[PDB]
Amino acid sequence: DAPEKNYERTMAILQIESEKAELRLKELEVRRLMRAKGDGPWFQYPTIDKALIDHSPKATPDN
Amino acid sequence: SWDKDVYPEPPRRTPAPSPQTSLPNPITYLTKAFDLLVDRPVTLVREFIERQHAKNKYYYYHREFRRVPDITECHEKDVLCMFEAEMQWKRDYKVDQEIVNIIQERLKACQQREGESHRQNCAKELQQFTQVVKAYQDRYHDLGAHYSARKCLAKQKQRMLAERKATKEAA
């Protein structure tokens, strides 16, 4: 290989691997924040569906 | 040949032969025999090979690296800039190694050439050797096997803090 080719190929490798490393660090920080706060699309543990509630008039009024 | 400024030599002063005896020395006869039997056939073979070179002349080049930004003006953990700075630093370190080698070759050539009066007559080469070894030592010594431009910059900043503190305490 030419030194130019190896040099610029090394630069492409370094850019790809540095971008992957920054995305892994951001992924760790995102997972930490979403587990702590629960406001993201991850760590959404189920609650009861409110569509199961009967909203009809019952046999007694006070409900 | 080479450049006579990077590899300097003083002018050669050989004395004229002043024979006092009547005995012929064998060295002149052996010099004539070496000129006839050895030097002329070697010269003719080299002239043949040199004509064969001159029939097909072609060239090679000394590779010129332009200056890229060094490690001081690279942002921290920016691998695309500090890669190029690190490669530039490694090339400059290899060239500084060869500069020290050139000055050592000058020192050794002066010591052989001046002979038994080498200590007086090689003070300039010794002084240039001391200056370039001090500069090389301040620049690259104690960096370790895992040297980089960052290690060298940290060493320089430590040395500059020591020099600034010594200047401040002496005033």
Side-chain angles (χ1 to χ4, degrees):
Chain A
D1 286 331
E4 295 85 0
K5 180 177 180 183
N6 190 19
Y7 193 83
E8 294 169 347
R9 183 177 67 199
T10 299
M11 290 179 70
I13 292 162
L14 287 172
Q15 193 195 14
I16 291 170
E17 295 288 328
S18 66
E19 287 170 351
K20 289 196 284 188
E22 292 296 324
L23 286 172
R24 293 187 188 98
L25 294 170
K26 289 182 180 181
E27 200 272 340
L28 291 176
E29 183 65 28
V30 164
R31 284 179 65 186
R32 189 190 63 82
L33 290 166
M34 292 192 190
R35 186 187 284 270
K37 291 188 283 186
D39 54 352
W42 304 344
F43 303 104
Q44 293 296 319
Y45 299 108
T47 59
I48 296 166
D49 192 1
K50 71 177 176 65
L52 297 176
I53 296 170
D54 196 5
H55 294 92
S56 298
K58 308 296 189 292
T60 65
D62 293 328
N63 49 25
Chain B
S1 179
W2 61 93
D3 193 358
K4 303 293 186 291
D5 290 330
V6 55
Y7 302 100
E9 289 181 352
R12 289 178 177 87
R13 295 187 294 119
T14 183
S18 297
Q20 194 270 332
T21 188
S22 67
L23 292 175
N25 50 357
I27 301 165
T28 59
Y29 293 97
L30 289 167
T31 303
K32 293 179 184 292
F34 189 83
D35 195 3
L36 268 298
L37 298 175
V38 179
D39 198 1
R40 291 179 68 248
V42 167
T43 304
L44 290 175
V45 171
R46 183 64 180 172
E47 286 172 352
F48 178 75
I49 300 169
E50 185 180 0
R51 288 191 297 272
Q52 299 306 113
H53 300 308
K55 288 181 181 179
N56 49 4
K57 184 64 65 67
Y58 70 104
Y59 298 103
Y60 82 102
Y61 302 98
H62 174 74
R63 185 181 283 271
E64 292 292 329
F65 294 92
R66 68 171 67 99
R67 305 297 295 168
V68 301
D70 57 353
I71 198 66
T72 59
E73 55 190 0
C74 296
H75 292 282
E76 187 172 1
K77 285 166 87 282
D78 187 1
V79 293
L80 275 305
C81 297
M82 75 192 290
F83 165 71
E84 297 187 349
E86 179 68 28
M87 296 301 105
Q88 195 187 21
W89 185 80
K90 285 181 180 177
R91 291 192 299 272
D92 293 334
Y93 174 42
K94 186 70 176 178
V95 172
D96 288 332
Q97 285 173 1
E98 295 297 324
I99 291 169
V100 175
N101 285 321
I102 288 169
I103 302 303
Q104 285 177 347
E105 287 173 350
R106 289 182 179 178
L107 187 66
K108 293 181 286 188
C110 189
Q111 202 276 334
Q112 171 53 241
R113 182 177 59 240
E114 299 296 325
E116 197 68 30
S117 63
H118 68 90
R119 185 174 292 117
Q120 181 180 3
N121 293 323
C122 298
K124 183 175 89 274
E125 287 84 5
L126 180 62
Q127 190 266 331
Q128 291 175 357
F129 173 74
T130 304
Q131 294 298 109
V132 75
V133 166
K134 178 65 167 64
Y136 185 88
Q137 193 186 12
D138 289 333
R139 193 174 289 185
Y140 302 119
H141 203 206
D142 302 331
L143 294 175
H146 296 287
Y147 52 74
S148 63
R150 285 173 60 193
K151 263 69 180 300
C152 188
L153 179 60
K155 182 181 178 181
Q156 180 179 356
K157 285 183 180 180
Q158 180 177 1
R159 185 177 66 248
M160 289 173 71
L161 288 175
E163 290 175 354
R164 188 180 71 184
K165 184 178 183 293
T167 302
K168 183 175 72 68
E169 69 183 2

